[PDB]
Amino acid sequence: VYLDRKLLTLEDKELGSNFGTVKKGYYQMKKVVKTVAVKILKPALKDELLAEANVMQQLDNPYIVRMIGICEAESWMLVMEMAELGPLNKYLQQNRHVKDKNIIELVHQVSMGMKYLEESNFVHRDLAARNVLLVTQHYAKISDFGLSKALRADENYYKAKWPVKWYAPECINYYKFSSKSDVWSFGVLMWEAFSYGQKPYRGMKGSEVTAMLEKGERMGCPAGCPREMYDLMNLCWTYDVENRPGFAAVELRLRNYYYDVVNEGHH
Numbered sequence: 436v437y438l439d440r441k442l443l444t445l446e447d448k449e450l451g452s453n454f455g456t457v458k459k460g461y462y463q464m465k466k467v468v469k470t471v472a473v474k475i476l477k478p479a480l481k482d483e484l485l486a487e488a489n490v491m492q493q494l495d496n497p498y499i500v501r502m503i504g505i506c507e508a509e510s511w512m513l514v515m516e517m518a519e520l521g522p523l524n525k526y527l528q529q530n531r532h533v534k535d536k537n538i539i540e541l542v543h544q545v546s547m548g549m550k551y552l553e554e555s556n557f558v559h560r561d562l563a564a565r566n567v568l569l570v571t572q573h574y575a576k577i578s579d580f581g582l583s584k585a586l587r588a589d590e591n592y593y594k595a596k597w598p599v600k601w602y603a604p605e606c607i608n609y610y611k612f613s614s615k616s617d618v619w620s621f622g623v624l625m626w627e628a629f630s631y632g633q634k635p636y637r638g639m640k641g642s643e644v645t646a647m648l649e650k651g652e653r654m655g656c657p658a659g660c661p662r663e664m665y666d667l668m669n670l671c672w673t674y675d676v677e678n679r680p681g682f683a684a685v686e687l688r689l690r691n692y693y694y695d696v697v698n699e700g701h702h
């Protein structure tokens with residue numbers, strides 16, 4: 436969990452930019468050298484980082500970004516495995532050629548990472564296309580656990596600026612975040628991915644979105660999105676937390692359809 440500042444090399448290039456900066460570098464390991472992304476800070480800003488690190492520390496899954504450890508030097512630094520191709524939304528924005536089967540593949544991988552995080556009783560609270568990173572065009576990993584919370588053994592929700600367009604009704608009305616509300620965010624993620632990285636509820640303020648949903652209105656089918664995937668989207672968008680599927684039922688739906696799509700190409 437604690438890293439050797441001298442074993443860390445940072446590039447002048449800044450990958451992203453709030454808290455401070457995200458830079459690329461390499462950590463000199465046992466024998467091999469590891470490409471890394473490093474979250475770097477500029478009191479309470481420091482405590483969020485530690486908490487964040489502690490969450491990733493506990494997570495062990497192919498579809499979730501892995502942390503290498505932390506470092507105190509010029510600033511506080513959170514060192515993670517590098518996801519070379521970056522955020523899912525921007526990739527799709529710049530790569531509109533990406534095939535339907537390839538998107539269904541990537542959203543299914545995120546369902547697997549989310550089914551694990553559910554099993555592990557963690558809430559993400561920030562599940563957005565921007566927070567999915569690509570290892571390859573066919574390998575996706577969930578990132579950004581700065582808003583994540585480990586649920587108490589006695590409760591199945593955590594009681595709390597907010598990414599409102601990604602939030603379920605219960606979150607807005609009752610400040611209650613559960614794995615089911617991540618399922619809601621997943622719906623919006625599915626939409627963003629089939630809309631090739633376009634922002635959801637275009638040009639509407641949070642207030643208006645809240646009103647639209649309450650009316651029973653949902654976002655429409657993105658162009659070229661299979662009916663079956665839009666059904667899953669709407670299902671994720673079940674207003675009443677109690678009747679909304681968990682990521683188990685969600686992932687299995689995706690798994691099945693993806694194999695039906697894989698069967699079709701071969702035919």
Ligand SMILES: CCN(CCO)c1ccc(Nc2ncc(-c3cccc(O)c3)n3ccnc23)cc1
Pocket residue numbers: 449450451457472473474500515516517518519520521522568578579580
């Ligand atoms: C230049 C932008 N660009 C595309 C290059 O053409 C680009 C941008 C980012 C990345 N890769 C990564 N960016 C940010 C984080 C990160 C940071 C903080 C927290 C956290 O959980 C994760 N990260 C973790 C692992 N890999 C990355 C790769 C390419």
